[PDB]
Amino acid sequence: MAFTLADRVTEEMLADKAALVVEVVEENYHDAPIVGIAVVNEHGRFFLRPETALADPQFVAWLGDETKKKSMFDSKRAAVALKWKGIELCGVSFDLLLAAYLLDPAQGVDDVAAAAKMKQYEAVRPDEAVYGKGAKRAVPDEPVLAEHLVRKAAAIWELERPFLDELRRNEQDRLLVELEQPLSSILAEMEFAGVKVDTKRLEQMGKELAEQLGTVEQRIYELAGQEFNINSPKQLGVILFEKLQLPVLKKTKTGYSTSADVLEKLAPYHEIVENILHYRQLGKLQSTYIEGLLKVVRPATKKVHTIFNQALTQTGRLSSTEPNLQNIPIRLEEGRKIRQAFVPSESDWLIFAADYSQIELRVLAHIAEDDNLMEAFRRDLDIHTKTAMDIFQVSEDEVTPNMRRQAKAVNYGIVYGISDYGLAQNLNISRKEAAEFIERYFESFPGVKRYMENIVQEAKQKGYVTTLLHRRRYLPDITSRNFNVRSFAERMAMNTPIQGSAADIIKKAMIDLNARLKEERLQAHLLLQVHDELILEAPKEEMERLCRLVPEVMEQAVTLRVPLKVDYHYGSTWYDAK
DNA sequence: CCTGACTCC
DNA sequence: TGGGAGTCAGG
Numbered sequence: 001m002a003f004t005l006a007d008r009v010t011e012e013m014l015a016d017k018a019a020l021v022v023e024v025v026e027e028n029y030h031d032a033p034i035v036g037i038a039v040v041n042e043h044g045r046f047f048l049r050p051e052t053a054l055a056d057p058q059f060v061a062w063l064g065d066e067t068k069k070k071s072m073f074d075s076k077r078a079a080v081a082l083k084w085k086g087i088e089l090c091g092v093s094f095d096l097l098l099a100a101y102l103l104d105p106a107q108g109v110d111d112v113a114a115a116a117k118m119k120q121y122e123a124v125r126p127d128e129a130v131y132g133k134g135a136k137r138a139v140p141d142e143p144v145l146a147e148h149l150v151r152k153a154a155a156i157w158e159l160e161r162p163f164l165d166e167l168r169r170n171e172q173d174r175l176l177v178e179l180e181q182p183l184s185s186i187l188a189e190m191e192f193a194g195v196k197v198d199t200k201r202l203e204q205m206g207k208e209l210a211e212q213l214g215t216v217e218q219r220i221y222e223l224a225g226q227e228f229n230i231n232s233p234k235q236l237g238v239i240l241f242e243k244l245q246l247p248v249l250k251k252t253k254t255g256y257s258t259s260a261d262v263l264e265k266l267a268p269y270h271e272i273v274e275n276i277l278h279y280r281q282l283g284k285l286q287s288t289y290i291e292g293l294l295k296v297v298r299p300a301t302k303k304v305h306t307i308f309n310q311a312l313t314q315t316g317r318l319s320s321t322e323p324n325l326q327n328i329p330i331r332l333e334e335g336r337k338i339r340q341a342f343v344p345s346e347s348d349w350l351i352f353a354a355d356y357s358q359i360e361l362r363v364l365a366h367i368a369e370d371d372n373l374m375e376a377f378r379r380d381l382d383i384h385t386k387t388a389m390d391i392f393q394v395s396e397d398e399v400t401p402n403m404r405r406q407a408k409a410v411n412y413g414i415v416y417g418i419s420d421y422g423l424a425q426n427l428n429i430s431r432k433e434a435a436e437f438i439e440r441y442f443e444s445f446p447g448v449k450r451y452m453e454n455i456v457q458e459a460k461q462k463g464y465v466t467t468l469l470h471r472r473r474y475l476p477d478i479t480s481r482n483f484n485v486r487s488f489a490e491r492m493a494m495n496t497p498i499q500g501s502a503a504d505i506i507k508k509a510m511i512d513l514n515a516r517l518k519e520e521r522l523q524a525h526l527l528l529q530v531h532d533e534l535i536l537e538a539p540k541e542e543m544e545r546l547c548r549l550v551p552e553v554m555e556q557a558v559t560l561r562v563p564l565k566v567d568y569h570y571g572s573t574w575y576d577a578k
Numbered sequence: 579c580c581t582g583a584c585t586c587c
Numbered sequence: 588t589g590g591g592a593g594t595c596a597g598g
C-alpha cells in the first residue's frame with residue numbers, strides 16, 4: 001500500500017472529505033501524546049508527524065472546519081487528546097467504532113482491524129500486533145508506525161459505505177448519525193471539562209477512616225479470637241465455617257461464600273458478621289473513593305477526568321473509568337459524604353442534579369402496554385405502594401414501609417427476570433410466599449406477563465431484540481436446549497429492551513439539552529451522566545432557569561404512552577444537590 | 579492474571 | 588436460581 005511520508009502539509013491533504021487518524025496509544029488519552037497522524041482522501045494517503053501538522057496553521061484550520069468531513073475510529077479519543085493541546089476537531093461525519101458497536105455490541109470491537117473483520121477487510125493489522133501488550137507495549141519505528149496508521153485510515157475510508165449500508169438496512173443509520181455521533185462530542189466536552197474535587201476534605205476523611213478501620217479491625221479479631229486477613233474471603237471462610245462452625249449456606253466454584261447476602265443471613269448465629277460487613281464497606285470507601293480517587297486527581301487543577309466508554313455495554317448504556325464516577329456512594333450516609341468532595345469548578349457556581357423517576361418501570365409500562373401499569377403512571381400513583389397492595393392484598397392504608405420495600409424488590413426484580421428463589425433470597429422471606437408475590441404481580445399486570453412471553457418469542461424468531469430508537473442485541477443462546485444458558489438469554493431478551501430504551505432516552509436528552517444551553521448562551525454545562533440522571537454545574541444565577549429547562553428537556557426527549565417524570569435539586573456540592 | 583468483595587443505576 | 592457496569596485486595 002503506497003503512501004507519502006510527508007514532511008510538510010500540502011493543500012491536497014486538506015480535501016473536504018478524508019479518513020483521519022490521530023493516534024493516541026496510551027489507553028487513557030487525557031493529556032496523552034499524539035504519536036502520529038494519517039490522512040487518506042481522493043488525492044492519496046499521507047503520514048504526518050504531529051510536531052509538524054499540529055503546528056501548521058492550515059492543517060489546524062482544516063481540523064476545526066466543520067464543512068471538511070472526516071471519517072474516523074474513536075473520534076472522541078482524538079478530540080479529547082487534541083483539546084488537551086488546544087486544538088478543536090470538527091466535521092466528524094462517520095465514526096467506525098460507534099458504527100461497529102451499533103451493528104453488534106457483542107463483538108467487542110475496540111480497534112480498526114476488529115471492525116474491518118466484520119466486512120472481511122484484512123489489509124490492516126490489529127493494534128495489539130503493532131504496539132504489543134502489557135509491559136511490552138511500545139511505539140514502533142517510524143516506517144512501521146506510518147504504515148499502520150495509513151492502513152487504518154485506508155480501512156476507515158473503504159469501510160464507511162459498507163457499514164452505513166448495513167446500518168441503514170437495520171434502521172440504525174439515524175441512531176448513529178443523529179444520536180451516537182453527536183453524543184460523542186458532548187461526552188468529549190464533559191470528559192475534558194472534568195469535575196473539581198475538594199482534596200483536603202477527602203484527605204481528612206481518609207485520615208479519620210484509617211482510625212476507624214483500625215478500631216473495627218481489632219474488634220473483629222477480638223470477636224474471632226484470632227487475627228486474620230478480613231479482606232481475604234478465603235481466610236474469612238475458614239474463620240466463619242471452620243473455627244466458628246457457622247452453617248454453610250452457599251459455596252462458589254472456589255469454596256465457601258462470604259457474600260453480603262450470606263453474612264446477613266448468619267446474623268442470628270454470631271454478631272461478628274455485622275462487624276465484618278461494616279469493615280468491608282469501610283475498607284472499600286478507603287481504598288477506592290479516597291485513595292483511588294486521590295491517585296487520579298490532577299494536582300494543579302484538582303480535577304478528575306473520567307472517560308465514558310460509549311462502545312462497551314451490551315444494552316447501550318455508557319460506562320465510566322479511571323475513575324468510575326457512576327458508582328459514587330449514596331445509600332449509606334457515611335459513604336454518601338464522599339459526594340461533599342465533588343464541587344463546582346468556579347467560584348459562586350453550583351451543582352445541579354436531575355434524575356428520571358423510575359424510568360425502567362415507565363418504559364416497561366410503555367412497551368408491555370399494560371393498562372394497569374400505564375394507568376398507575378398516567379395518574380402518578382406510587383407504583384411500589386400499588387404493587388404492595390396487590391402482592392399483599394391490602395388497602396393502601398395497611399401497607400407498611402417494609403411491605404413497600406418488598407414490593408419494590410418485586411417491581412425491579414420482575415424487570416431483571418428474578419425467580420421465586422432469588423426473590424426469597426434477596427428479601428430473606430419464605431420461598432412459598434415469594435412465589436405468591438410473583439404470581440400475584442403477573443395476575444395484576446397481565447400485560448407484563450404477555451410482554452415477557454412475546455419478547456422471548458420474538459428473540460427466538462429474529463435472533464435479536466431491539467430498543468425504542470432501534471438499538472439491537474443479538475441473543476444466539478435463546479434457543480439453546482440447555483436450561484441455564486437459555487434461561488440467561490431469556491432474561492436478557494426481557495430486560496434489554498427496557499434498559500436499552502432507557503439508555504436511548506437519556507442520550508437523546510443530553511443532545512437536546514446541550515442544544516438548549518447553547519441556544520440560550522448559558523454557562524451551565526454537563527459534567528456527568530449516571531444512567532438515569534444528569535449532573536451539571538452553572539453560575540448560581542442560572543439555577544432558576546435550569547430548574548425549568550433541564551426537567552422539561554429530559555421529560556420531553558421522547559414521547560411514551562406514559563409520562564416521564566424528572567426530579568431535580570441543586571447545591572454547593574454534589575452531596576447537597578439533594 | 580482471576581475471583582469475590584464493594585459500589586452505582 | 589435478577590439486568591447492566593468498574594475497582595480493589597488477595598491469591
Ligand SMILES: Nc1ccn([C@@H]2O[C@H](COP(=O)(O)OP(=O)(O)OP(=O)(O)O)[C@@H](O)[C@H]2O)c(=O)n1
Nearest residue numbers: 357358360384405408409410412413416426587
Ligand atoms: N430491590 C431492588 C431495589 C432497587 N434496585 C435497583 O437500584 C436502582 C435504584 O433503585 P431506587 O432508587 O430505589 O428506585 P426508586 O423506584 O426510585 O425507589 P424510591 O421510590 O423509594 O425512591 C434501580 O434502578 C435498580 O437497578 C434493585 O436492583 N433491586
Ligand SMILES: OC[C@H]1O[C@@](CO)(O[C@H]2O[C@H](CO)[C@@H](O)[C@H](O)[C@H]2O)[C@@H](O)[C@@H]1O
Nearest residue numbers: 027028074077110111307309310311321
Ligand atoms: O477511547 C475509548 C475507546 O477506546 C477503547 C479501545 O478502542 O477502550 C480503550 O480505552 C478505554 C478508556 O481508557 C480503556 O478502558 C480500555 O481498556 C481500552 O481498551 C474502546 O473500548 C473505547 O470505547
